Ligand binder design. Structure first.
Ligand SMILES: [K+]
Ligand SMILES: [K+]
Ligand SMILES: [K+]
Ligand SMILES: [K+]
Ligand SMILES: [K+]
Ligand SMILES: [K+]
Ligand SMILES: [K+]
Ligand SMILES: [K+]
Ligand SMILES: [K+]
Ligand SMILES: [K+]
Ligand SMILES: [K+]
Ligand SMILES: [K+]
Ligand SMILES: [K+]
Ligand SMILES: [K+]
Ligand SMILES: [K+]
Ligand SMILES: [K+]
Ligand SMILES: [K+]
Ligand SMILES: [K+]
Ligand SMILES: [K+]
Ligand SMILES: [K+]
Ligand SMILES: [K+]
Ligand SMILES: [K+]
Ligand SMILES: [K+]
Ligand SMILES: [K+]
Ligand SMILES: [K+]
Ligand SMILES: [K+]
Ligand SMILES: [K+]
Ligand SMILES: [K+]
Ligand SMILES: [K+]
Ligand SMILES: [Mg+2]
Ligand SMILES: [Mg+2]
Ligand SMILES: [Mg+2]
Ligand SMILES: [Mg+2]
Ligand SMILES: [Mg+2]
Ligand SMILES: [Mg+2]
Ligand SMILES: [Mg+2]
Ligand SMILES: [Mg+2]
Ligand SMILES: [Mg+2]
Ligand SMILES: [Mg+2]
Ligand SMILES: [Mg+2]
Ligand SMILES: [Mg+2]
Ligand SMILES: [Mg+2]
Ligand SMILES: [Mg+2]
Ligand SMILES: [Mg+2]
Ligand SMILES: [Mg+2]
Ligand SMILES: [Mg+2]
Ligand SMILES: [Mg+2]
Ligand SMILES: [Mg+2]
Ligand SMILES: [Mg+2]
Ligand SMILES: [Mg+2]
Ligand SMILES: [Mg+2]
Ligand SMILES: [Mg+2]
Ligand SMILES: [Mg+2]
Ligand SMILES: [Mg+2]
Ligand SMILES: [Mg+2]
Ligand SMILES: [Mg+2]
Ligand SMILES: [Mg+2]
Ligand SMILES: [Mg+2]
Ligand SMILES: [Mg+2]
Ligand SMILES: [Mg+2]
Ligand SMILES: [Mg+2]
Ligand SMILES: [Mg+2]
Ligand SMILES: [Mg+2]
Ligand SMILES: [Mg+2]
Ligand SMILES: [Mg+2]
Lengths: 91, 59, 101
RNA sequence: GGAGCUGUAAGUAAGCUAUGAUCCAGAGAUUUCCGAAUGGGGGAACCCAAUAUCUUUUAUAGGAUAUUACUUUUCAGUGAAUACAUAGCUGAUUAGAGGUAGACGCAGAGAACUGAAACAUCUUAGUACCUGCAGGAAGAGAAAGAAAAUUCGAUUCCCUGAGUAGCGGCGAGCGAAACGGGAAGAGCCCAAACCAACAAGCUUGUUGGGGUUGUAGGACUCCGAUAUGGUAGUCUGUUAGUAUAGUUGAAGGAUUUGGAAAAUUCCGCUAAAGAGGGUGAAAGCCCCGUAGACGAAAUGCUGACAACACCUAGGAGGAUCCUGAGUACGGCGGAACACGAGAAAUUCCGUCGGAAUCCGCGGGGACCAUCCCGCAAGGCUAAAUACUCCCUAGUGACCGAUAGUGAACCAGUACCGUGAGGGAAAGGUGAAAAGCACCCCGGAAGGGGAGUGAAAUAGAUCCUGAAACCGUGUGCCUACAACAAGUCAAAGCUCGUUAAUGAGUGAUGGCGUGCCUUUUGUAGAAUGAACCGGCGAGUUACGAUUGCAUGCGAGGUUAAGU
RNA sequence: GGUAUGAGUAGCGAAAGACAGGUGAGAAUCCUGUCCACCGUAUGACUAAGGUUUCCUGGGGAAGGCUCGUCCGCCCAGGGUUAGUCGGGACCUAAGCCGAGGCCGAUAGGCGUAGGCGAUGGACAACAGGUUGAUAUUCCUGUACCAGUUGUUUUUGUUUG
RNA sequence: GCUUCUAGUGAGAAAACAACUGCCCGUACCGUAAACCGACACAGGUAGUCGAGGAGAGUAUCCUAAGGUGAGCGAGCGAAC
């Protein structure tokens, strides 16, 4: 897959916003991307230097509307920690 | 559109595609935040990339 | 449909029979159309639509397209529509007089 | 194709479209992962590699694309015991591997309940099931046939023969075939003799020629013509048609009723169109259509035409040669033939034995003779036949939501089950949402107004709205009475009708043990029903027979089929 | 299928609660406080399986909860699971399973060699504290370890190596 | 896995220090349970670890610690059974 397709979007939440204060950035990533790919994708997309990437899988969540019930899509969340002496991401 | 894509050369179409993929990356990020107004742009860009790849294949 | 947005039509059946108006919008999939000043309804709206009183709004409801006959612009009379080729452009002809549209 | 469009699904939002959008049809591109799956593994939709090239990083790690299963066919290369070899091994090449339409076909294997009023033969059945192989059809098919009217001339299927001949614990049952009439029709290639070439160890293989059968044919030897006819050949083009989008397509206005007209009345008109659907009720003339005329860039399919390919010799001679062997056939054991071993021919399977070959061989229901008909042990073959998961257009004295598919509705779903598997319920506001602004009680729910509407006692649990069941009002009766509860007689009171020698209630009096089933006999202390509603049981096909009816009558009548 | 009868009857599932204050339309039943009481080889603390969002936060009170409900493992709306070192894979094998060729067999298939799969066992590198409403040997702080990579300096070996 | 041995493989090796690289899956929560198996927020069933004090042989017993709990109908009355 292309590097520009690995990173889907940022994650903006109370937890991710807090983590930005520590210079780590949460993204939704392609479910098939390993944390090394994410590191490479982040660096090429933002010119930053990445110190560490932590990565989790998010299970699909049960939801219902009216008479219909199903599941939200599975997601893959990558927390990218930038090095010191490095540019930050500005989303 | 298709007319002007067929005018460009192979290298230009490869480059044109990478410019669109980046714009698509930015649009997704602008959509994730409350910063994207013309949300119809995303489909426009996706189909423009599709049109280029279709043309690339029929050459 | 044989009637089109912007057409001048005459209502041939309904409560508003013999009224005339312009087609404000056409609904080909429903075979319905909206005509100015025809089939008005009094709608009891809650004010959640940027109208800070709610009020009872008067709007035009659609009517079936077969209740409307297009008006002959050159003659002012309602007429059935024929399709004759002019300049290679397929156009609507007034069956009654032969005028176009 | 010509004005809207961004599905169901609104809503906001943001957009597209006369530079032609959405939409429609033909042709292409893309087509993640699992799944035969096939690089390896695996608890399907996941994990882990090799090799090559590319890419990321200073680099390792990372990423991309390609190739890599197994067996088969052919070729090449390597290459054991083991001398040459062979096997193995590596690569290439080639082709299969799974799924279905729960149908139709052929083949292997193959029940039982059941019937026989028991039951082992028999029957159910060669059916169900399982498995293999298919093909659009399959199978069969070009006489070692049917016959003995003298003849017919491949096969298949339909009518008939006929419930006949037969088979059968001669029981129950099973049950032909030929002739006759139809549908459809079509015929052909090999093996062998012999000839030629090549290769090998005079034959002994390969190739090509030759040859194809029963009034026997062919080889062979003679002469004589290189014509004439045919085809179940090919992504050979060309052409036409056709399927898959479409275009065009006549003729009505008033009046009365109504919320609305298509109803009504009045006069009109159109019809190669008075099929049908929709539209505010029931429309030939408002809409979609219909009859009719018309249309194809593209891709299929079909038919011709052309091309090309492939088949197609006559007559006379018999000296010799050929004409399917472990075959035919026989014994034994099974099976198939309607035919159950029977007097059992014919066909096949296993086992053993085992021919002739044209002066021959097989069949004509044991067998022999005679006569007649055919020529096995090699293959192929259209049509008439079977079936329909799907596609298109229709049809119905078929269903109309307890029906009709299990499923009209997000159903093979929910739900049940470890699993195979079982398997529901559930349609309707209105013409249009015009889906009740606003007010009032209430936390809300829900109501009351006010509105919308023709109608809301059409307010979404929404058409109609039965019954059981629950309640409110009250005309008459009821607190000394033992009552299948009604019926007949009857005062009093309260009412007034489909106006009838009326209606409701009823003190009191006479008489009186439900319904059904099953029984000699049931109120039965036998059975069944809680109640109400819906659903729920002699039908159809083919045959037999009788009555009635009609037609014809010593005659009556066709079946398949066209 | 609907609705009765029994009935406003049986039952409401092993146990201690009390009061004050609060919240709220409404509270025996929600919150807070106080005392009281119960478990304590546990009714505590972990964790495998199994479940699969039930976790957290903010709202809600139709239904579910055998009463009630302002509350809930319920409903609505948002969020939450971070590891070279933990457990599993890129390590190993047991039982068993699969099985190239192979052997056997009406079909289907059965068995089985090489080769594999397969833990419940073998092997294997970090810990303490802190931090959030919800994760932590995973994040952070401090201090480590294991495998490998690039470079610098230092030594010694270049085919009698 | 590991440790040895040569056979083979070899031009380079090792140490110190500096900088740097290290993938996939699980990791919420319940878990002697109202969140698992029992149709139920059901007196049943559910492997392993830790499991304190006094008296005590003890993980028995009684009462307690850390910690957890008052268990999803109540109010009266104080008949028969
Ligand atoms: K597989
Ligand atoms: K079928
Ligand atoms: K039997
Ligand atoms: K019997
Ligand atoms: K055939
Ligand atoms: K018969
Ligand atoms: K019998
Ligand atoms: K020939
Ligand atoms: K109309
Ligand atoms: K009509
Ligand atoms: K064509
Ligand atoms: K016989
Ligand atoms: K015969
Ligand atoms: K014969
Ligand atoms: K109504
Ligand atoms: K009453
Ligand atoms: K009486
Ligand atoms: K009895
Ligand atoms: K009941
Ligand atoms: K009751
Ligand atoms: K709450
Ligand atoms: K790990
Ligand atoms: K283990
Ligand atoms: K965790
Ligand atoms: K002690
Ligand atoms: K103790
Ligand atoms: K309680
Ligand atoms: K009492
Ligand atoms: K007692
Ligand atoms: Mg992780
Ligand atoms: Mg695979
Ligand atoms: Mg019997
Ligand atoms: Mg017309
Ligand atoms: Mg009329
Ligand atoms: Mg028989
Ligand atoms: Mg014989
Ligand atoms: Mg024999
Ligand atoms: Mg003859
Ligand atoms: Mg055929
Ligand atoms: Mg039904
Ligand atoms: Mg009904
Ligand atoms: Mg049903
Ligand atoms: Mg009514
Ligand atoms: Mg109703
Ligand atoms: Mg007395
Ligand atoms: Mg009295
Ligand atoms: Mg008796
Ligand atoms: Mg009785
Ligand atoms: Mg009695
Ligand atoms: Mg009974
Ligand atoms: Mg009682
Ligand atoms: Mg209790
Ligand atoms: Mg105690
Ligand atoms: Mg104890
Ligand atoms: Mg909670
Ligand atoms: Mg909460
Ligand atoms: Mg309750
Ligand atoms: Mg481990
Ligand atoms: Mg095996
Ligand atoms: Mg095999
Ligand atoms: Mg082994
Ligand atoms: Mg360890
Ligand atoms: Mg926690
Ligand atoms: Mg945890
Ligand atoms: Mg329990």
């Amino acid at each position: 897959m292309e590097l520009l397709d690995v990173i889907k979007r940022p994650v903006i939440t109370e937890k991710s916003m807090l983590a930005m204060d520590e210079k780590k950035y949460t993204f939704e990533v392609d479910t098939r991307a390993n944390k090394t790919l994410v590191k490479q994708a982040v660096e090429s997309a933002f010119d930053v230097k990445v110190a560490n990437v932590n990565i989790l899988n998010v299970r699909p969540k049960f939801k219902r509307m009216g008479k219909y019930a199903g599941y939200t899509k599975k997601r893959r969340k990558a927390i990218v920690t930038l090095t010191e002496d490095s540019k930050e991401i500005q989303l | 559109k298709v007319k002007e894509i067929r005018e460009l050369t192979t290298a230009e179409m490869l480059d044109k595609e990478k410019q669109l993929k980046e714009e698509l990356f930015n649009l997704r990020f602008q959509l994730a935040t409350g910063q994207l107004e013309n949300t119809a742009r995303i489909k426009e860009v996706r189909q423009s990339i599709a049109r280029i790849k279709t043309v690339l294949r029929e050459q | 449909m044989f009637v089109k947005k912007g057409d001048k039509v005459k209502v041939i059946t309904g409560k508003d029979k013999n009224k005339e108006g312009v087609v404000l919008a056409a609904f080909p999939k429903q075979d319905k159309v909206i005509v100015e000043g025809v089939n008005v309804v009094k709608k009891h709206q809650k004010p959640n639509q940027a109208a800070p009183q709610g009020g009872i709004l008067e709007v035009e409801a659609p009517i079936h397209v077969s209740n409307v006959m297009v008006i002959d612009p050159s003659n002012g009379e309602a007429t059935k529509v024929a399709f004759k080729e002019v300049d290679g452009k397929k156009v609507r002809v007034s069956k009654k007089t032969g005028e176009v549209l």
